[PDB]
C-alpha cells in the first residue's frame, strides 16, 4: 500500500466526510456552545471593576476551562463506537496504525475541538468586556484550544481500547472532579499541606484556568479609588490583579503564563502516546 | 384490598429488601461518599482563619451542595428502570398510586439520601474544623439532607414517566449547571442585571449553599489582627463572615437561614407533586 500520507489523507477524508455527513453530533454541540456562550455573555455582561469584579472574572474563567473539560467527555465516544470496525479494519490491514490514529485525530478531534474554543472566545470575550488587547484575545483563544485538546487527550488515553462507554465515562467524570478541586478557585492551592499539594500538577484545569487568569487579571485593578501600588493601611485588600494572582499562587513572570501551555502540550503528547500504545498493544487482541 | 397503610408497608418492604438485597448501587455510593469525604477532609484539613480562609471555606461548601445535586442524578434511575413493572403492576391493580409513590419514596429515596448527608457531615465536619457548636453541625446535617431530597425531587419530577434514562440525564445535567452558576460563588448574585436576576430563585444550590454558608460564616472572622467591627481605613477588606455574607447578598437575619429550608421543602412538595401527577396521568397510558 501507500507509505504514510495518502492513507491518512484518505481515511481522514472518510471520517471527515462522516462528520460532515452527520449534523447531529456536530451541530448539536455547536448550538449548545453558542447558546451557552450567549447565556454566559448575558449573566456576566459588562464585568465591572468594583469589589465584586474579582470573584466575577475568576468565576467565568473557572466555568469555561471546566466546561471544556467536560466538553471533552463526548470525545470518549469516538474510539469506542468504531472499535469493531477498527479491529476488523486492522485484521484485514487497510492501514498503518499511526496513519489510522493520526488520521482519525485529524478528522474529528482537530476541527471539532477548535470550534467551541473560537466560538466561546469570540462571543463571550466582548460581551463580558475582558481585556481589549488583541493578543490577550489570542491567548484566551489558543488556551481554550489547548485545554480542550488536552482534556480530550486524557479522554482518549483512558477511553481507547474499551468496549463500554459508560464505565470510562464515570471514570473520566471522577478524575475531572478531582482535577476540578485543584484548580485555583475552589481550594487556594498554596495552603494545601505539602504531602498532597504535589498533585496539583496532575490537574488539567489548573493549567487552563491558570493561563486564562494569567493573561486577563495581569493588568487589571479592582478597587475603585484605590490605586494600591504600594498599598498602605489597607493590607488584606486584594486590590490588583497581581495580588489575586500571587495570593492564588501563580507565577506573575511571563514564563509562568506559557509553562502552562508547555505543560498542556506535554500532556497532549503523553496522553496521545498512551492511547497510541494502547492501540499498538490491542490491535492484534481484536 | 387494604386501604392505605398495609400496602405501602408491604411494597416498601419489597423494595426496601430489594435495596438491602442489592449491595452494588448502595455500597458503591457509600464507599464513594466515604472516600470522597475523606479526600475533602484531607485537602481542606484545618481551615485557617487567614486571608485565605474565606475562599477556602466557601470552596468546600460549594463543593458539597453541588456534589449532592449531581449525586441526585442516580435518582433518575429509580422510576425509569421499573417502569414496565410499574405499568404492568398498575394495569393488574396491585396498589393505589399514592400508596405506590409514597411507598417507593420510603424505600429508596428516604434512607439512601440520608446516608451521604450524615456521612459527609460527620467525617468532614471535624477534619475541616468548621464551627464547634452542635446545633450548627445539626443545621449542616439537615441542610445537606434537604438539598439532597430536593435535587433528587427535581430528578424525579423530570425523570418520571420516561423510558430512556439518558436524555433525562443530559437534561438534568444541563439544568444543574444552569443552577450551578446562580449559586453564590461563581457570579455574585447581587450584580446580575435585573431582567434575569429574578431566576436565582429557581436554583436549588443557592438554597443549599446559602444555608450552609449562613450557619458557618456567621460568627467567624478572617483577618488576623484585624477586629473589623466598625472597620476603618481598611474598607474593601472582607474581614468578617458577615461582610462576606452581605457582600454575597444573603439575609443575615436568622429567618434568612430558614427560608432557604422552606424554599427547599416547598420545592420538594412541588416537584414530588409534579411526579405524582405524571404518574396519575401516565398510569393508564402504559
Amino acid at each position, epitope marked *: 500500500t501507500t507509505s504514510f500520507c495518502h492513507q491518512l489523507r484518505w481515511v481522514s477524508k472518510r471520517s471527515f466526510k462522516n462528520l460532515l455527513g452527520n449534523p447531529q453530533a456536530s451541530i448539536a454541540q455547536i448550538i449548545v456552545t453558542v447558546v451557552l456562550g450567549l447565556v454566559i455573555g448575558a449573566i456576566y455582561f459588562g464585568l465591572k471593576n468594583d469589589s465584586t469584579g474579582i470573584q466575577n472574572r475568576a468565576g467565568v474563567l473557572f466555568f469555561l476551562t471546566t466546561n471544556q473539560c467536560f466538553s471533552s467527555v463526548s470525545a470518549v465516544e469516538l474510539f469506542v463506537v468504531e472499535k469493531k470496525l477498527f479491529i476488523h479494519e486492522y485484521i484485514s490491514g487497510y492501514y498503518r496504525v499511526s496513519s489510522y490514529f493520526l488520521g482519525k485525530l485529524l478528522s474529528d478531534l482537530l476541527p471539532m475541538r477548535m470550534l467551541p474554543s473560537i466560538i466561546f472566545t469570540c462571543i463571550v470575550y466582548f460581551m463580558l468586556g475582558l481585556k481589549p488587547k488583541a493578543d490577550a484575545f489570542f491567548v484566551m483563544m489558543f488556551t481554550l484550544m489547548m485545554v480542550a485538546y488536552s482534556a480530550s487527550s486524557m479522554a482518549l488515553a483512558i477511553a481507547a481500547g474499551q468496549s463500554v462507554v459508560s464505565v470510562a465515562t464515570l471514570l473520566m467524570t471522577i478524575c475531572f472532579v478531582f482535577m476540578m478541586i485543584f484548580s485555583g478557585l475552589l481550594v487556594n492551592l*498554596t495552603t494545601i499541606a505539602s504531602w498532597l499539594s504535589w498533585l496539583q500538577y496532575f490537574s488539567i484545569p489548573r493549567y487552563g484556568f491558570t493561563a486564562l487568569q494569567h493573561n486577563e487579571f495581569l493588568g487589571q485593578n479592582f478597587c475603585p479609588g484605590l490605586n494600591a*501600588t*504600594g*498599598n*498602605n*493601611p*489597607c*493590607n*488584606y485588600a486584594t486590590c490588583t490583579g*497581581e*495580588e489575586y494572582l*500571587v495570593k492564588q499562587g501563580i507565577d*506573575l513572570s511571563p514564563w509562568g503564563l506559557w509553562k502552562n501551555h508547555v505543560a498542556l502540550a506535554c500532556m497532549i503528547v503523553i496522553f496521545l502516546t498512551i492511547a497510541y500504545l494502547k492501540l499498538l498493544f490491542l490491535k492484534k487482541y481484536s | 384490598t387494604t386501604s392505605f397503610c398495609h400496602q405501602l408497608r408491604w411494597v416498601s418492604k419489597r423494595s426496601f429488601k430489594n435495596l438491602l438485597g442489592n449491595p452494588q448501587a448502595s455500597i458503591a455510593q457509600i464507599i464513594v461518599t466515604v472516600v470522597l469525604g475523606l479526600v475533602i477532609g484531607a485537602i481542606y484539613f484545618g481551615l*485557617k*482563619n*487567614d486571608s485565605t480562609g474565606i475562599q477556602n471555606r466557601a470552596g468546600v461548601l460549594f463543593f458539597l451542595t453541588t456534589n449532592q445535586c449531581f449525586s441526585s442524578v442516580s435518582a433518575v434511575e429509580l422510576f425509569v428502570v421499573e417502569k414496565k413493572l410499574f405499568i404492568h403492576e398498575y394495569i393488574s391493580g396491585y396498589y393505589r398510586v399514592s400508596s405506590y409513590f409514597l411507598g417507593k419514596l420510603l424505600s429508596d429515596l428516604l434512607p439512601m439520601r440520608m446516608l451521604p448527608s450524615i456521612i459527609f457531615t460527620c467525617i468532614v465536619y471535624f477534619m475541616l474544623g468548621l464551627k464547634p457548636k452542635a446545633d450548627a453541625f445539626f443545621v449542616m446535617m439537615f441542610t445537606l439532607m434537604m438539598v439532597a431530597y430536593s435535587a433528587s425531587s427535581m430528578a424525579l419530577a423530570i425523570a418520571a414517566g420516561q423510558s430512556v434514562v439518558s436524555v433525562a440525564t443530559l437534561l438534568m445535567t444541563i439544568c444543574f449547571v444552569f443552577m450551578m452558576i446562580f449559586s453564590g460563588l461563581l457570579v455574585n448574585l447581587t450584580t446580575i442585571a435585573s431582567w434575569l436576576s429574578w431566576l436565582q430563585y429557581f436554583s436549588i444550590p443557592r438554597y443549599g449553599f446559602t444555608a450552609l454558608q449562613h450557619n458557618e460564616f456567621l460568627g467567624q*472572622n478572617f*483577618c*488576623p*489582627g*484585624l*477586629n473589623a467591627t466598625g472597620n476603618n*481605613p*481598611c474598607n474593601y*477588606a472582607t474581614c468578617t463572615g458577615e461582610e462576606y455574607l452581605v457582600k454575597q447578598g444573603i439575609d443575615l437575619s436568622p429567618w434568612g437561614l430558614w427560608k432557604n429550608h422552606v424554599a427547599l421543602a416547598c420545592m420538594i412538595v412541588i416537584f414530588l407533586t409534579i411526579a405524582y401527577l405524571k404518574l396519575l396521568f401516565l398510569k393508564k397510558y402504559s
Partner: antibody
Amino acid sequence: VQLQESGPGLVKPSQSLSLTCTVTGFSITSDYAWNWIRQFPGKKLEWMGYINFDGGTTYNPSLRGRISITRDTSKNQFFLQLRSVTPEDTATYYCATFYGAKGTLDYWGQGTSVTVSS
Amino acid sequence: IVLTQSPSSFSVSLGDRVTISCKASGYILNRLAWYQQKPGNAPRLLISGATSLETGFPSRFSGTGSGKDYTLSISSLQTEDVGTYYCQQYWSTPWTFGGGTKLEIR
C-alpha cells in the same frame, strides 16, 4: 502599647520553658494579634508564632509540637511554653505586636535571653 | 518564602548614600518591611509596605523596588543609622526575615 515579658533565664535540656508577656495599653482580645519572635545568638531572626485576639493560634511550622501559646485575658498576659528544648534554642526572645491591616510587627518586647544549658 | 539579603556587610562613610537590596524567592508584592535593630535592642519597624515610612524617623530613608528586588536607600548616612537592617516579608506565614546587613563606618 507597652509590652514586657519576664521568666527564667535558663532551662535544662529536654524540658519545657515558659515565658509571659504582660501587655499594658490594649486588651489581648481587643484588636491586634500577639506574637513571639526568637533571635539566634548573633544575627538571625525567626518568627515563632501569634495568638490573635480571638484565641486562634498560628505557629512557625519549624516549631511543630514544641511551642504552645496561651492566653490569660484578665491580666492581659500571653504565655509561651517551649517543650523538648535544645541548646540550639538558646536565643534572645521577644514578644511583638502585629497590626494586621498594616501587616508589620509594629511593637516589640524589650527582650530576654534564654539559655538552654546542662 | 526565603528572603535573601545580599551582601551582609557594608562599610560606607558618614553622610553618604547606601543601598541595601533584599531579594525574595517568590513574588511578595510590596509586602516587605525593613527593621532597624540597634546593638542590644529589639527590631524597630522602619519601612512598611516597602515604600512608606513609620512616623518617628528622619525621613532620609527610602524604600524602592518591586517585583522581587527591593531596596532600602539611605541618603546622607548618619551616625545613628549604623546597625543591622532586616528585611521581612509578610506576604505569607511564616514571615521569614532576612539575614541582616551590618553596616560599618569607614
